[PDB]
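Teaching note: in complex prediction, the entire set of molecules is handled at once rather than each chain in isolation. The prompt given to students was simply: 'Predict the structure of this complex.' The entities are:
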Amino acid sequence: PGSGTMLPVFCVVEHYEEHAEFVLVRKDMLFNQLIEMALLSLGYSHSSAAQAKGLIQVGKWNPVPLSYVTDAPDATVADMLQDVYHVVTLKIQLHCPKLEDLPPEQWSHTTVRNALKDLLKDMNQSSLAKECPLSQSMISSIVNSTYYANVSAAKCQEFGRWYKHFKKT
Amino acid sequence: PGSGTMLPVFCVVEHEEHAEFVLVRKDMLFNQLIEMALLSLGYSHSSAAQAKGLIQVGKWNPVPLSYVTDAPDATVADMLQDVYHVVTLKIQLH
Amino acid sequence: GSGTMLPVFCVVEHEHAEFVLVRKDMLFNQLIEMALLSLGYSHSSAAQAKGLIQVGKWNPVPLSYVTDAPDATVADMLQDVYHVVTLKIQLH
Amino acid sequence: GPGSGTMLPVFCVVEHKEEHAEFVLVRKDMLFNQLIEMALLSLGYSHSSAAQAKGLIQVGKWNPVPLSYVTDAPDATVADMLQDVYHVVTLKIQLHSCPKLEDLPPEQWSHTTVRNALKDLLKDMNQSSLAKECPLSQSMISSIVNSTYYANVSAAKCQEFGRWYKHFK
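The expected output is the structure of the full assembly:
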């Protein structure tokens, strides 16, 4: 188990407004093309390994960006995962219905948080807290990301209905 | 008997399913097969980046273009010259 | 890290030494057969086939020492240790 | 456009290196998973040699794969899988052999495998009783035996002798 040319890596691919399993990769290749190779093995355009974001998660920890693992471009898959491949899960994010088109009950806290994140680019919290069904101390929690920080099914459903309408006016 | 610059590939696009042959350049890179199939089929560049692509030899289990060969410099002639007529490229658009 | 497959590192002698994925839910007593299939060997070669198993740096033991339970999944015996073991399949 | 009869051709190559190529006919409705033994039997090989046999299937110039990649259906026939594709695939069979001279498909006999047969016979036979039995002359059995560089045995004779040898023994 290393020896060998391959290393098993458990992968999960995603995109959100089974599919989760080991793929053998080249222990000898570059840690920084791991997302690419994993995705190719799965059948993904070369260019689909571009709109792709990677989060690596140890046992039941919060996952972190592959940035945290190492900052040496020259490290390999083996250098880094030889020892942990049995406990790590690679989380690939592929970055298409529109938010306004999402029906209010399909709305989740993650999509509310995404919706809010876009809006705040070109708006203010107090103003946004004004006719969206959220409060200001509610809206800070969700964007802060901590910890938690939770929107009930009722508010999620209402924020989403409001969002659909707000977007077409 | 295809000594052209091109080779035809039968394509199915999933998501209502769009099928058609497409002529692919033999000098182009095998792993670029999905991009080219898509462009050449009447889709965007952005469409490629949002697409999973498997190749199917007869009635066999479809497989990623990487099961086929581990040589990145592999031309479309290299891999498809002998089998283009028995292979279906099925593509998915998310 | 719990899907339908487990990575098993297999060395076949008589080289061929590498990881092969196998169905967790399969029967531990079909581990040779099914590992052999995934490499090319026929339904016939598995088995005239002798299997030992080596945990870390120990001597390797026959696969019988691992268990008697005929209803033992591969998961059962290997979900916990697949990463420290080596399956050695000899063909007579 | 062939659509019936009970048989199907299967191009097989067989290493053991003595690379031997040849189409063979196999029972269309047999099981795909016993292809490697069916091909070997149908090629003139004993059941013994099929027990060390590694078999990889190859389409065109692609990476060769185990028969388990092609399919998962444990009841898929040779017809299901290769009916439409028999003319672009090769069954690459590797044996740990060589087979006993008698188990060597007679089409694969050369002047040197004929020589080894003669030797093994002359260990307990006469030049004349051999020359009586086998399809060579005494003159040629002199030629083959007393000269290592003697290769002037026709293909037709090699096969003939090889069939004769297979018999008895």
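Point out the following to students. Chain D is about 35% helix and 20% strand. Residues 155-167 of chain D form the longest helix (13 residues).
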